Amino acid sequence: SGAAKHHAVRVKPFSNATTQPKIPDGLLTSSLSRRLQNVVGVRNGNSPSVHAGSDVMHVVIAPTLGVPVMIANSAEGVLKRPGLSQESSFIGFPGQTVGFENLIESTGVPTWPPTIPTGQKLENKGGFVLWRIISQGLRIDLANSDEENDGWFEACRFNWRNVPRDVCMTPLDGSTTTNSIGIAPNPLWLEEVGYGMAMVEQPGYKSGLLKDIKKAEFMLHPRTTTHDPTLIDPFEYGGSMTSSGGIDNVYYPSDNVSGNAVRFRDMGVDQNMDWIYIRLHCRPNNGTSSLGSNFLFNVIQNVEVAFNPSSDFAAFQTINKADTKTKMVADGLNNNPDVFNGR
């Protein structure tokens, strides 16, 4: 049937079954989908202070809108965020429908970084307010030569604590300056949960060699029950959002109890999905004799949205027909807690 391609994309995020996947449950009567993808080379960094004497690169793949991947202790992170935000780098989906634009609220002039405490406005540029994740996957390949392919990795999926300050907003293209913004997992989660986490005790935890990580594939799991959409609400902020104050330009709620913090958390995250945390114990990188482990990151976030009539995409929307196999497809998918499976 026609739902076969949708189910295939549901269980295999990188599947080539269809360019316009859907969750065939009939929730979004008329909707369109985009397969957001990005491929980036990532290398563990040589940090002077924050990750001094550490060859561990920390990866969080989260169901956030636009910037699902956060990497701490990457060379790009050390370059772009020196000593700030855990020297992290972000992989997002620039030049694709989703995203926001920061404006000065009083005048409407786009502005990045935000000039807080002055009033700001995150303008939703996607032409949609309801969105959900069909499936989200990450593929990591060790791109070093055979004489430098040493190291290992550990990974586990987990139930996120839903703390507003665990998510942040950063440019979709991974820079610190472009005013096309997405929602990313905050590096603050690493130093409050991630670094101290007892990974081995999490169900589904797995480990392996970096030279074999190219055979692994990490994907988030949805619920077996109906996958409710996330509603993007209007968002304006003054001092209710904050950053480290440095050139990293990673902004997150100033606290966890304000109404803005909860609104930001709810609108920026698909809370039907789980999170995955990966530690890459890489080849050392000191810049003189060891130059770290270079990786190939391939992240795909399949998203279904309901476009509003003002959008030019509203003409392309198609009908979402409910299928009888959707629930059992999802249950079969999420009945295995293994953090990764073979490609």
Q: Minimum distance from CB of 272 to a copy of itself (Å)? A: 9
* Binding of residue 53 to a copy of itself (CB under 8 A): no
- Binding range to a copy of itself, per CB under 8 A, among 77-85, 107-115, 151-159, 168-176: 151-159
Contact with a copy of itself (CB under 8 A) among 106, 177, 286, 336:
336
Distance (Å, rounded) from C-alpha 153 to C-alpha 240? 37
DSSP lists the bridge partners of residue 102 as: 122
Contact with a copy of itself (CB under 8 A) among 48, 117, 195, 331:
331
Distance (Å, rounded) from C-alpha 84 to C-alpha 248? 6
Identify residues 204-263 at the interface with a copy of itself (CB under 8 A).
Answer: 204-205, 207-211, 214, 221, 223-226, 231, 233-236, 255-257, 259, 261-263
Size of site (CB under 8 A) for a copy of itself: 110
- Binding range to a copy of itself, per CB under 8 A, among 72-80, 84-92, 127-135, 176-184: 127-135
- Helices 326-334 and 3-11 pack at an angle, to 10 degrees, of 20
Which residue spans within the chain are E strands per DSSP?
30-43, 56-61, 69-72, 88-91, 100-104, 120-124, 128-142, 152-158, 167-171, 181-185, 206-209, 216-219, 230-231, 235-237, 241-242, 252-253, 275-281, 294-307, 318-319, 340-342
Contact with a copy of itself (CB under 8 A) among 49, 53, 109, 201:
201
Cα–Cα distance list, 132 to 98, 203, 243, 304 (Å): 12, 26, 27, 6
Q: Which two tokens stand for residue 279?
A: 């530690």
Q: Minimum distance from CB of 333 to a copy of itself (Å)? A: 9
Distance (Å, rounded) from C-alpha 183 to C-alpha 38? 15
* Binding of residue 125 to a copy of itself (CB under 8 A): no
* Binding of residue 195 to a copy of itself (CB under 8 A): no
Q: Minimum distance from CB of 246 to a copy of itself (Å)? A: 26
Identify residues 61-90 at the interface with a copy of itself (CB under 8 A).
Answer: none
Q: Minimum distance from CB of 297 to a copy of itself (Å)? A: 10
The nearer residue to a copy of itself, 109 or 315, going by C-beta atoms, is: 315
Give the closest residue to 51 by CA, choosing from 248, 166, 191, 241: 191
Give the closest residue to 302 by CA, choosing from 70, 33, 65: 33
* Binding of residue 163 to a copy of itself (CB under 8 A): yes
* Binding of residue 4 to a copy of itself (CB under 8 A): no
Contact with a copy of itself (CB under 8 A) among 52, 145, 245, 342:
145
Q: Minimum distance from CB of 113 to a copy of itself (Å)? A: 20
Distance (Å, rounded) from C-alpha 336 to C-alpha 332? 8
Contact 205, 113 (CB under 8 A): no
Q: Minimum distance from CB of 341 to a copy of itself (Å)? A: 11
* Binding of residue 309 to a copy of itself (CB under 8 A): yes
135 CB neighbour count, 10 Å cutoff: 25
Residue with tokens 């913004």: 181
Contact with a copy of itself (CB under 8 A) among 54, 179, 202, 244:
202
Q: Is 128 helix (H, G, I), strand (E, B) or coil?
A: strand
Contact with a copy of itself (CB under 8 A) among 77, 307, 329, 340:
307
The nearer residue to a copy of itself, 247 or 319, going by C-beta atoms, is: 319
